[PDB]
Design a protein around this ligand. Structure first.
Ligand SMILES: [Zn+2]
Ligand SMILES: [Zn+2]
Ligand SMILES: [Zn+2]
Ligand SMILES: [Zn+2]
Lengths: 311, 311, 311, 310
């Protein structure tokens, strides 16, 4: 029995989780803008979620690069952590041992252990959020890398001299296949051909900026030409990438979750269909599966809890 | 005590390799023009290399996708081989256990176990030649992939819609970081500004296309502006690539070898400099060493012989 | 009243064309393998077509860089002409006044003066064949540029570090927007997803290699999915580019034509839809029309003739 | 005898320009925040400059898409203007006839008629500022295009699915060869190897983001390895471009001017050399000349002036 925490931009969330990934308790606080308030909000959230239960360790999913010690947040893009010991600060204050994991590595292990990855051995997970993140599992282990920063798939350059990424470099995959990307793609199309977007503009404020990640997903189901076109474009870079990861890792299966994948096979099919249409030498090689995530949002919590059991 | 085989375009070497990766007796045969005759020449070579030696097992470097069961060449670009059961074929006609490995994988592992990898756990190898290829070690074991076809690095797409590649896909990395690329960039630069290739051209037939691989590594070490600056361009693509593999697996070390690196730190240093510059991170995330391969060309032969002791 | 010449690769055709651009007599002659044999063959052609006809001039469509004096082929890619004085040669030997033009320019002028171009002042014609080619008409004149070599739209570099081109460069538009292109796209796709290209692979010989341009323009209208997707890919590069010519010259009408446009609204339409999708200034700038090319094959001859009317 | 006007984010300038492009007077008014106020400050500036002189017309340098009718500003990326009838509004409030030109096109014509274009026919002008803009001259006539929005070189896509542009499409040339681009390249390379940028970080504030356009040109003329390498990187894209315009227009000359070129052959020689390294089939074809722009900052103003006489 253990507790996991997903540190998710709007809300932090803690929970007591059994050996089969069942949430016995949830508790949530509004994420702080500050640096040190996160530690304070985390313990607050641990102490709320423990709720009488006899807890052994605590695993935290932080959105940022976490080290190979599973101890420190090396760098987050938003929140100012400079080599900040998060294990050390929280261990001394909730008494119990702590382990810190990359946010998506948590999700990755979450889906693999209790989700769509059950009964596979070699598995790559992607998540399509505002950005694009993931994790590896090879041989039944999470693979952090030697320094702890492995599978930062979002910043594999896809387009040289590409778009400015939120990380510094240009052309990162995260700027072409993601929730950010999707919206760019809508707006671009939307601006040129306003007519073939009457159902999609009719959802926001009517004007070319009122477009949001939700508006597209729905506007597409009702087949709004521009909406569905923006999924193709996404599906493209999405699939391209999967094919590149397929060339490098050759998994049994990719497991695509994310906010924009909790939409279903409106998105998942085109990407599976792009992947196939972009994989190399498929004639001779086995095609990996492109499965969707089962645990949706919960992944990282459960992932983190169970990752807090490993040595 | 075990034999390794390296199936070269010109010639097929079969050597006896000991526990410590030491070639005790190489033996050679010419590479016939047929597909089916190669299987004879492999046996012919394993015959003669094996004279008066207590041999246990035999590994084969295959220039194509090898499966996970390590027994068939699924597809080779230059040998007419399709689902060709090289293992069963040779196992039957030599009388000793056989494994078949990807040629890139053998050399990757050969370097990891007896070469430049010693004392590392997570390692990614590249070798630059006509092409680009390599292998992966994560946690002390070669990682072939779920289906046996991993680390086909050569073909991670680096330019969308880019240069035509021999795997039939546009924009692979092989096309930009490889002896073949090196040459292209020289031919372009030399043709733009002939005045700076006073030395480089003099080495070939004084002509526009005379340039060949060797002539550049010669012209470079002789401080020739075009030949030194072609290596700068090969560095950009080579490094930028490693920086991306650094995001995927984030190893403790890249090991960079093959024909193009035989020329030494003239080639490797500007790469190491490119790698550092393209690396996503900054001064928080630590850098993976870029080491020179030690076992030169014998990598494939040696490493194959060791992969013959696995399971 | 005047004769034009279409220097076809398998025959040479001289034609008598009136003030209203309608062909009277037409005399063809085998294309010889020798360079000056084409001169000889042009003169024979000219003679044979000028039967009891009051002929004033002879315009000649040459597929090379013609100069500003409309006289020398400065370079033909196939014919061995370097600085050939084709105007003075052919004048001397047939007694009539002569003028030489780029073959795309003849096509361009023909279509502006006798096709989709009528009632427009500023117009840009693109003809999609093995390559791309075109011509500028601005202020009702053809615009050869200072040195003669205007309008080589084929080789304006759309993908830096892209595809090696006949012109000797990488990433030229020609390689992305043309027959040669469409076919890549089909082959890449068909080999990726055999299942979907079942009609396309029928029309040829079963195999990926057996695919040919005309088989796709058919397999499309029967709605073969691979063959349509390949027409999307083309329409993307063709429109993307048109929208760049639109930002350069800002014409009243583009006129897309030549081999893979004479197929019709199967193609023009997606292009027209892809030009609007990529045009910048959606809501403010009027949209230039995308018209289909009325004269088909004929144009080169008809334009050459009529360009002979002035200087 | 006529009046040109130059509408610039900091100041508007309206001068009197004779037959040979010579400025005889110059008046200036600070540029107000409203769209509806620029209208007035322009009237103010023409009234201020037409002192004593017999002016026959006004030409106006609009920083935005102007139409074929030389009368409307269809959209400006800064000035809040949509289908603004600037010609009519001004004509009626000064009493002299007015024409409204694209600002790049004003500049082009000025340079072609009075500066480095002297004695050419087919000529393409590029000005290299915060962004890249320009104008096309073919057969001694500025070419505005069918709808007047022609010549907009800045936004030919050089890198597909590339950098975000201020027109909202990705990849535009403006994002790769321009004052802004120059800044980015400087920053990137000094962040990559600060040791070769000691001289340049000095001129700024020791710090990677304190880098600005002026700082770099000075750092290069003191041979600062990074400032130079960042004009190499500007040259690469600047020529590649000029090379593709060579392919389209084949002019007798490109005239490269504006903010970044103010620095001279330290910038143009890299470019002039890149243009050659990217020109298609340049042993058969004749090469266009790359020439330094003569009239510097004034071109737009002189240009607008003469464009009021065509
Ligand atoms: Zn990034
Ligand atoms: Zn490839
Ligand atoms: Zn070309
Ligand atoms: Zn733009």
């Amino acid at each position: 029995l253990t507790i996991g925490v997903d540190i998710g931009g709007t809300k932090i969330a803690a929970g007591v989780v059994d050996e089969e990934g069942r949430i016995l308790s949830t508790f949530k606080v509004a994420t702080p803008p500050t640096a040190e308030g996160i530690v304070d909000a985390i313990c607050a959230a641990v102490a709320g979620a423990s709720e009488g239960h006899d807890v052994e360790a605590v695993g935290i999913g932080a959105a940022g690069y976490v080290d190979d010690k599973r101890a420190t947040v090396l760098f987050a893009p938003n929140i100012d952590w400079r080599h900040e010991p998060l294990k050390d600060k929280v261990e001394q204050r909730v008494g119990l041992p702590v382990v810190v994991e990359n946010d998506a590595n948590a999700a990755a292990w979450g889906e693999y252990r209790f989700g769509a990855g059950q009964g596979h051995d070699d598995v790559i997970c992607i998540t399509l959020g505002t950005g694009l993140g993931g994790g590896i599992i090879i041989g039944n282990k999470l693979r952090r890398g030697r320094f702890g920063v492995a599978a930062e798939f979002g910043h594999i350059r896809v387009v040289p001299d590409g778009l400015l990424c939120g990380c510094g470099s240009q052309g990162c995959w995260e700027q072409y296949a993601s929730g950010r990307a999707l919206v760019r793609y809508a707006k671009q199309r939307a601006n040129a051909t306003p007519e073939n977007a009457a159902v999609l503009l009719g959802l926001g404020d009517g004007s070319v900026d009122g477009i949001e990640g939700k508006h597209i997903s729905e506007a597409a189901r009702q087949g709004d030409p521009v909406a569905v076109d923006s999924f193709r474009e996404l599906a493209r870079w999405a699939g391209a990438g999967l094919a590149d990861l397929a060339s490098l890792f050759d998994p049994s299966a990719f497991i695509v979750g994310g906010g924009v994948s909790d939409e279903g096979e409106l998105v998942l099919d085109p990407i599976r269909k792009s992947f196939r249409r972009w994989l190399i030498g498929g004639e001779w090689r086995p095609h990996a599966q492109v499965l969707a995530a089962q645990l949706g949002g919960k992944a990282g919590l459960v992932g983190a809890a169970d990752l807090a059991r490993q040595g």
